[PDB]
Ligand binder design. Structure first.
Ligand SMILES: [Mg+2]
Ligand SMILES: [Mg+2]
Ligand SMILES: [Mg+2]
Ligand SMILES: [Mg+2]
Ligand SMILES: [Mg+2]
Ligand SMILES: [Mg+2]
Ligand SMILES: [Mg+2]
Lengths: 55, 149, 271, 77, 100
RNA sequence: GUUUAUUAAAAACACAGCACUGUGCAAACACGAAAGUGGACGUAUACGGUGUGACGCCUGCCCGGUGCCGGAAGGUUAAUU
């Protein structure tokens, strides 16, 4: 359902260092986190998001 | 060895000056060219005989070279075609030979060895600036338009 | 495929064959052959300038197109056939204009496959392009060293060359030996590796097999007399000497390259 | 035929003496080099096998003068 | 006959020529009886991290419905095309037309 | 299989296999004052040299000495000046 091109929402689920926030913090459901993890990893490949704050 | 210059030289001297140069420089470059000849009493007196003529002869050729230089600049743009692939990247190349022929085609006779391409050999489609060195002290410019269907 | 011979007799126990059913079973292309009389290691003075050469099966040379200057004309692989002059196989290709030539068979080429040579040819195995057009990192064989001279690198059965990098007018190549060398980008190269990669797995199995391909026995230096070889004699098995060639030059470590002309193209040696 | 075409220098024989004065026969070869000389009088290059000393003779005497001597001697160039 | 979503990155120096790429690619999909459902030219944008010493690239988003063979050679075009970098293709169970 | 033709046929030589090492092509190497020729109309799955000697299980410790390879700061050091 959730799409990786929507970077604005993904910014809320990544820390300042680019880490993917844990589910227990955000409180998202398990199914959506798996989609979320794929989306963030996929944006990183396209450089829509940074892998880490150091480059 | 000691030689006297028959033509202007950048870092060596002007016409008529007797200068000392390496044997290799004179034997391999100056003497084979018309720039200088060995400086001996036989040549010095003989050189003095046409001292005025050589200076006058050299003066007009620079003007003559300049005269043919401006008309080269008149053809500000020249159109050529080559094997151009996708992205405009030319599969082949357009060297001094192709450019030399193009300028003469419906233009002015141009030597194939005095064209200057500092950037490269124009391996990509587009517009490039090619400099021309027609005489030692004068330069010329022209734009080469390269495109293909 | 590689098949072992059953030990029905000594000399066949260890024989391992490399059988390729795809190779043409008939005679080669007649108008593209020529005489290949053997030499036996003798030079124009009649002296043996290279030992352990002589005899073997008669062979006829067949002209292989190492240059591939037929630009823009596609060709179809008619068949693959045996070539006694080299480890690799040669593919007979028919240009649709009506010309026939031999080329080194790439790794995957088969009868009926299309090939093309030229600057605008597609990036596909068997095609020949200048290395300035081939993508960096591509695996190529039959690599040229001077433009228009013909391929001279990676001609063996399973050899290939990798284009590690390109800059200026030169392309850096990693040769099969591990050496990295510079070559002009205008030189031509053939995409893909040479076929018959299973050539190294064959085992001759017997002395006669070596003789069939013109290799004569090699006599150990230590088995000679002092007058014949530096390793010389000595009653019993005595060596007591640093290994050397028959002419006294040390072996097992001593370098021999002395070409000051071509070091500018050698970015790094094999090791 | 390591013979200079201008000066006629040819290899000569001699000995090399060691610290113990052992004499072994040797040769002294001329410093020959194939060089192209432009004949101003003929608008062309002429190739000659000349020694380094012969090269200096060309400068002092001129290429035109020496070729006359080579022609007179019968040397082909 | 499967849907696909294709995002390919073009070199900034070839930004002006990007529209040339789209027409050629769409022709290949259409020429093989395929169709394009979405097509966006996002233009120049800032890269999150450098890519081959490059900080800004031209972005193109294209969603198509083409057979396997059409996409196969399309990938090969990206591979050997130096102008385009870091291209990916998707599989989707339905066509998409929203801007997103 | 080969060998001391004419006192030695063997455990000797060769051998397939194995390992080290050299060689990027005008290859190393070898015959040649040189040209040139072989290696090879071959191109590192190739070629030369060396040792070992099918195959099976294996091949341990030592780099001080000699050799080879790599290094270059320092010491010593030729012609030349
Ligand atoms: Mg041998
Ligand atoms: Mg052996
Ligand atoms: Mg003995
Ligand atoms: Mg003993
Ligand atoms: Mg017997
Ligand atoms: Mg006997
Ligand atoms: Mg033994």
């Amino acid at each position: 359902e959730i799409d990786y091109k929507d970077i604005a929402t993904l910014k809320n689920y990544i820390t300042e260092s680019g880490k993917i926030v844990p589910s227990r913090i955000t409180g998202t459901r398990a199914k959506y986190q798996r989609q979320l993890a794929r989306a963030i990893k996929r944006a990183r490949y396209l450089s829509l998001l940074p892998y880490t704050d150091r480059h | 060895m000691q030689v006297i210059l028959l033509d202007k030289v950048a870092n060596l001297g002007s016409l008529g000056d007797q200068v000392n140069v390496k044997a290799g420089y004179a034997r391999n470059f100056l003497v084979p060219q018309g720039k200088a000849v060995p400086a001996t009493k036989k040549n010095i007196e003989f050189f003095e005989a046409r001292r005025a003529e050589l200076e006058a002869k050299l003066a007009e050729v620079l003007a003559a070279a300049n005269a043919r230089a401006e008309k080269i600049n008149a053809l500000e743009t020249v159109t050529i075609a080559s094997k151009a692939g996708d992205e405009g990247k030319l599969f082949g190349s357009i060297g001094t030979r192709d450019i030399a022929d193009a300028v003469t085609a419906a233009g002015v006779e141009v030597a194939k060895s005095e064209v200057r391409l500092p950037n490269g050999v124009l391996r990509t489609t587009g517009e490039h600036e090619v400099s021309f060195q027609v005489h030692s002290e004068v330069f010329a410019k022209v734009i080469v338009n390269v495109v293909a269907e | 495929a590689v098949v072992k011979c059953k030990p029905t007799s000594p000399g066949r126990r260890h024989v391992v064959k490399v059988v390729n059913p795809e190779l043409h079973k008939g005679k080669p292309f007649a108008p593209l052959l020529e005489k290949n009389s053997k030499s036996g290691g003798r030079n124009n003075n009649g002296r043996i300038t290279t030992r352990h050469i002589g005899g073997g099966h008669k062979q006829a040379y067949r002209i292989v197109d190492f240059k591939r200057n037929k630009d823009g004309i596609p060709a179809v692989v008619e068949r693959l056939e045996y070539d006694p002059n080299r480890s690799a196989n040669i593919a007979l290709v028919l240009y649709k204009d009506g010309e026939r030539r031999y080329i080194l068979a790439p790794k995957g080429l088969k009868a009926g496959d299309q090939i093309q040579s030229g600057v605008d040819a597609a990036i596909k195995p068997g095609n020949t392009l200048p290395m300035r057009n081939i993508p960096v990192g591509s695996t190529v064989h039959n690599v040229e060293m001077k433009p228009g001279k013909g391929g001279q690198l990676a001609r063996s059965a399973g050899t290939y060359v990798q284009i590690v990098a390109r800059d200026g007018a030169y392309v850096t190549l990693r040769l099969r030996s591990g050496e990295m060398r510079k070559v002009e980008a205008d030189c031509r190269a053939t995409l893909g590796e040479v076929g018959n990669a299973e050539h190294m797995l064959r085992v001759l199995g017997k002395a006669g097999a070596a003789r069939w391909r013109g290799v004569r026995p090699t006599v150990r230096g230590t088995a000679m007399n002092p007058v014949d070889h530096p390793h010389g004699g000595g009653e019993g098995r005595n060596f007591g000497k640093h290994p050397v060639t028959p002419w006294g030059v040390q072996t097992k470590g001593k370098k021999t390259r002395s070409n000051k002309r071509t070091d500018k193209f050698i970015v790094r040696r094999r090791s | 035929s390591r013979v200079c075409q201008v000066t006629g220098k040819r290899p000569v024989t001699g000995n090399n003496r060691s610290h113990a004065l052992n004499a072994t026969k040797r040769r002294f070869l001329p410093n020959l080099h194939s060089h192209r000389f432009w004949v101003e009088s003929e608008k062309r290059f002429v190739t000659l096998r000349v020694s380094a000393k012969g090269m200096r003779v060309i400068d002092k005497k001129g290429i035109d003068t020496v070729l006359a001597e080579l022609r007179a001697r019968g040397e082909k160039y | 006959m499967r849907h696909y979503e294709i995002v390919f990155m073009v070199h900034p120096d070839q930004s002006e020529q990007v529209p040339g790429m789209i027409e050629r690619y769409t022709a290949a999909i259409t020429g093989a009886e395929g169709k394009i459902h979405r097509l966006e030219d996002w233009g120049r944008r800032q890269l999150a991290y450098p890519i081959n010493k490059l900080h800004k690239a031209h972005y193109v988003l294209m969603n198509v419905e083409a057979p396997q063979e059409v996409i196969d050679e399309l990938e090969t075009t990206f591979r050997f095309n130096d102008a385009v970098i870091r291209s990916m293709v998707m599989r989707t169970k339905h066509a998409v037309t929203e801007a997103s």
